[PDB]
Symmetry: D2
């Protein structure tokens, strides 16, 4: 039934037939022995699933084991929201187990926190830390700052010239002009204080702005493009080298994120009664403080850590992020956390605990949050999509939930380490 190549190509270019009529082996035969290239399988074929299936068959014959894809599932998944948006050369999907850790008592509310992980004991441990938090009157958090950044590098012909652009940007008149250009690109675009830094005839300019409920990379980058266009009108010798000169900084470790913040800067806290630490966490307060100082402060310091003065906030950040359609690679900066434990109340037997996380890069609109399964997890928290009355509130709430769930996860791993657990039981 697989027709000759010259004939199949005619039915393809037929506007009232298309690949809908061609068989699987015929679409394959045209990719092989080049005619339809390979990447162009996306736009031609009838349904999205049949494109995934064809691409899987092509892929199977190139592999050293033909049936590698047998347990990689692809059927019945909604690919309409994925193609052209979230992923390319799609051959299926990867199911990541999702557990629940809660209720999380935070700001006089309750939250059932979804967490997608394959590390056993992670969700149970976090769930225990939530119960301890809940039995001690609950947690409270504050968003200290909010604004996604982009950190382009431009080049003037000399360091003195880039010193002049730095001085001009620092004047209130220069900032008003660059803020007009930036703010015109979108209704959420509101440029805050510019931070600049020189390295010879390079000039790194840190544009920061809130992005409503989106994480905001696409919004700040568009705002930055036009802003540097307006700056170029005043300084035509300027050469834009890159929209990112790693000064944002995005998806790399960097002290500037730790010190200036990026996206949402958050602080959570709680006071656990001496009873709850004993019963739920199987330790004392004196022991928790001892482990936290010498592990999370002194230990991190001996390791040469910048922004890693914590136990495992990266476990909780990553688990929520995958569950809620966040950019999981932004875990690199979003895990930044200092966990602090001290005595509280009369005997100095109650455990004070606070996690401060300067650079939670998060958003409840765009990216993976347009997909329905990760919209479901966002809906658990009540933060799905945009907030009309109070733009930004949903992404800020989710940032607060991340910091609170980190603190829950911190209480439980630190408690296990304090009561002598060396291995995953």
């Amino acid at each position: 039934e697989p027709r000759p190549n010259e004939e199949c190509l005619q039915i393809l270019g037929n506007a009232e037939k298309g690949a809908k009529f061609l068989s699987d082996a015929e679409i394959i035969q045209l990719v092989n022995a080049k005619h339809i290239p390979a990447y162009k399988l996306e736009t031609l074929i009838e349904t999205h699933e049949r494109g995934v299936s064809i691409r899987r068959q092509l892929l199977s014959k190139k592999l050293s084991e033909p049936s590698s894809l047998q347990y990689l599932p692809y059927r019945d998944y909604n690919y309409s929201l994925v193609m052209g948006a979230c992923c390319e050369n799609v051959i299926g999907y990867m199911p990541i187990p999702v557990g629940v850790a809660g209720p999380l008592c935070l700001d006089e509310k309750e939250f059932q926190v979804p967490m997608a992980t394959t590390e056993g004991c992670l969700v149970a441990s976090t769930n225990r830390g939530c119960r301890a938090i809940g039995l001690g009157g609950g947690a409270s958090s504050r968003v200290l700052a909010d604004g996604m950044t982009r950190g382009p590098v431009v080049r003037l012909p000399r360091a003195c010239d880039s010193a002049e652009v730095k001085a001009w940007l620092e004047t209130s008149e220069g900032f008003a002009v660059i803020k007009e250009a930036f703010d015109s690109t979108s209704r959420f675009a509101r440029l805050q204080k510019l931070h600049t830094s020189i390295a010879g005839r390079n000039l790194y300019i840190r544009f920061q702005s809130r992005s409503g409920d989106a994480m905001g990379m696409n919004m700040i980058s568009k705002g930055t493009e036009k802003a540097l266009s307006k700056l170029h009108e005043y300084f035509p010798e300027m050469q834009i080298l890159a929209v990112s000169g790693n000064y944002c900084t995005d998806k790399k470790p960097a002290a500037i994120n730790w010190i200036e913040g990026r996206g949402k800067s958050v602080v959570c806290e709680a006071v656990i009664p001496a009873k709850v630490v004993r019963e739920v966490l199987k330790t004392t307060t004196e022991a928790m403080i001892e482990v936290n100082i010498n592990k999370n402060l002194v230990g991190s310091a001996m390791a040469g850590s910048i922004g890693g003065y914590n136990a495992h906030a990266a476990n909780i950040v990553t688990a929520i992020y995958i569950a809620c359609g966040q950019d999981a690679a932004q875990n690199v900066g979003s895990s930044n956390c200092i966990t602090l434990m001290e005595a509280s109340g009369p005997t100095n037997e109650d455990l004070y605990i606070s996690c401060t996380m300067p650079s939670i890069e998060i958003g409840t609109v765009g990216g993976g949050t347009n997909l329905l399964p990760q919209q479901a997890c966002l809906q658990m928290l009540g933060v799905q999509g945009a907030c009309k009355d109070n733009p930004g509130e949903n992404a800020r709430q989710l940032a607060r939930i991340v910091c609170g769930t980190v603190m829950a996860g911190e209480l439980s791993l630190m408690a296990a380490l304090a009561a002598g657990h060396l291995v995953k039981s």
Copy 2:
């Protein structure tokens, strides 16, 4: 039909009946009137899918939106390998779109590389970087080191005693004693030179060893347990404060991983002819090196980066990790990368590129790699499971692939920044 609470209880305490003979609403009426806790749902119910179903039903009526879970899938998924191994309190699974970039021409072989992401353009950009490497003759990698670590903190009564223990561990006979205890806990356990650091009466002890094709955390922790128990026979006043004093360092940014290594230290390289840089990357070598020097080195320096001297290593690392059953939270350390670009060839128009990644924390057995869909992705690369013939070969191969694919994504992203793109197109 829904029977009273006491009738349902004695059916649940019956052996040749049990939970199979109750309806969902009856089990839920038992949980509401506090006869069965939430965590007891795992061991009472017959099937795992029915346990996930009933946990979802309770969860839904605690939420502000009772239909929020509608689009979080849960059915027809193999929870036999998840319950009590990878996740707890399971309410479903989050599907991450999976894409393929390849062939990745690495060490005279070809790799179809799975990439689970929700960020648009990442799989297509990475795939273009692969094309540039393929038409450039290919890439070559070496594994420079190998050994997962654990960095426990112990406490001596005084600093003079911690110094005594440090000197003892540095003697070849004291080290032999501890290497015997450590190696006895597993067939892969081979303890390497002990790196130690004192902070007052604290002593941080960095145990390092290979772990076959396992990532190594369970195996190193077990070897660390017995090793410290032997050290205590020689120094009984020693206090084992925590199995991790953040010296390892695991899932936090730390300079020690950058300088000493953790897991696999790997380097990848390639020469991209000027012709390939022109037709695939749409830019010149000269423009590309200018961006790399001033973004990936200088820019990263101004930012105060330790080990983040790259464009988006974290994008590629994270995507391969989710797809292949790795711990995504370990992208914090595993993303460590310095990207170098120089001029090669006749008139300095070719592009020598290399990515050095000293701390890739990876494996092909254990964790999420026991799950069949994550195994499907590992089979794409011919690195699933353990190697009987040559232990470590699979995990070393996946680490070489993570490095070469990072370099593919570096080429492509850096080309796009060089060519004047400031926004995703």
Copy 3:
């Protein structure tokens, strides 16, 4: 010698053995003698002789000099328990062509080749038409740590400081304590119920440490009136950061942030520096950026800025302990000119902590070195321009030092 009863009854009429024997049988306490003796130089001699009696080598103080020094400006100012002085050889590297001027730079060092090397660096810069420089920013900082009952309370204080009216009353309290106290933008960080506050201000030509400490004093007291439950834990919570390696000094700057640059003709790199522009760029990329990167350095992207900074600081009465942060520097080298064969060099030092008044700039030997550079004392027609000028000179002299050593390294020097 006379007995010990005739001496208690002034101090000028007694001998050195007499006052010593009063403390050696416990007649008089030792914290009395500071004021008792008339001449300052005999206070030093006695303190030495008392100290000789405790050392296993009595005569080890023999070649530690002490005579013919002006101790009047030091005592109750720069040093205590003074037993003499330490001579540090001063050399001169110049002339240095910087912003249409020439500078003979004094360098107090005991390291061989350092002054000759820096001096060759100046020769290369001179023959390439000199160096240019700009002060990018200027503000000494101080970073107290305060605590409030909860993290929610300290968040409230942070928000309060970020409004214009909160910053206005804090600026009112800060500016009141001194002439030069003009408070710039505040920077804050929270860690739980901790709150770190970075007060930045110019301070005339002084380095400013004590001035900002006074400004921070009244400013925290004002914040205490707004927030009565605020414990003031310390005036320095290491957030300044003063005399320790910190990323915040590198990123925000501290004291003077300065940039400096030069082009060295291809001919000059060949004949004076004995290398090639290409090779210089190769060593700079791979040593000062890639190498420092591998070593895990924050702000140490240079060859030996600290050699030059420390030498000038000791000679010019600066606080040499501040070389920790002042040495922060990134040396960049690029190709330049029509044939791409000329060597563009630039050093960027974001945190040079410096001044030309107060501290050890009060001493006459140190003021001699400051006068060489034409920057001594307070600039009367532009308060703070002498301190700016010395910072600029440090950056240009640091760049000269980089040129020479990197040229040496590139020509295969494993010496000295």
Copy 4:
């Protein structure tokens, strides 16, 4: 007369006055660089240089108060300094006794910062009344960290693996060790960054700081490496991997020079009467300043109050390289409760990269030697090579801790200005 004075230059220089030599330079019969030799004495060669310099300054009376007479320039010329125009007096104060390891020390400190010696001295008083401090040198080994390039990263991987084999390190150790009597190479640490290779040589240097000695050994060791790997370019003797006089985490973790630890318990009475505070307030300030504060500031290795003050003061006093306080001041200061009722103050400073020596450099000069002799660590130690330098490093750590106790007590007592 111009032409008359040239004829006398051959017979000498001492039969020409200062004004006659200077006229010979200003109308160029002789260049500027011919003063090191022709002028017969060191003090008078400095004098003519100052006169030549004085005319080029906008204020020609600039150098009147820079001293130069009656100083030993012979140990300075061609070893410690060049283009010498005088010396710079730094006041030396004294802080002691410092009770360290069953001994007493009077510690010299060259500083122009008010209250530093007086405060360092109060910290000694608290330590003395607490029953003395203790200390241990945990490591010793100056490093050099050169950079080399091979054609490929694969080739540099081949060299790293070779340098890790028992036999590769044996051939290298032997070449390094032959150049000096103290040259004894410990295990190598290598990091690759592409086709670059950063090799960290480490060896003790007797009582010398070791920069010259390990440079010699590194040079020789790389020439043996070049014989096994001819395509290897030697880029630079330092690829900043040592790392010398720059902030770098490799010194914090691996150490460089003397890694040292120090400790002491300070009784409750002593904290209240000498230091005017409590153990509980000191602990609170130390946690939140030296740990949390430094963490918030992005500190690598600077977990202390003012270690750099003490290190700089002693270094300049004792003829050390004061530039090297960049890394030698790396310190973590820890305070916790101690004793039966948690009222005594355990304190410890750990300083992993103290770069120190008692022979060579500024320790060849006599005033600097006087300060070393006070401590009893001057010059080489014939019986136990290295022991004078280890003792000075222990003194630096103990004195720093005295300095931490004092300043931290002042901050805890509520003093905001000095």
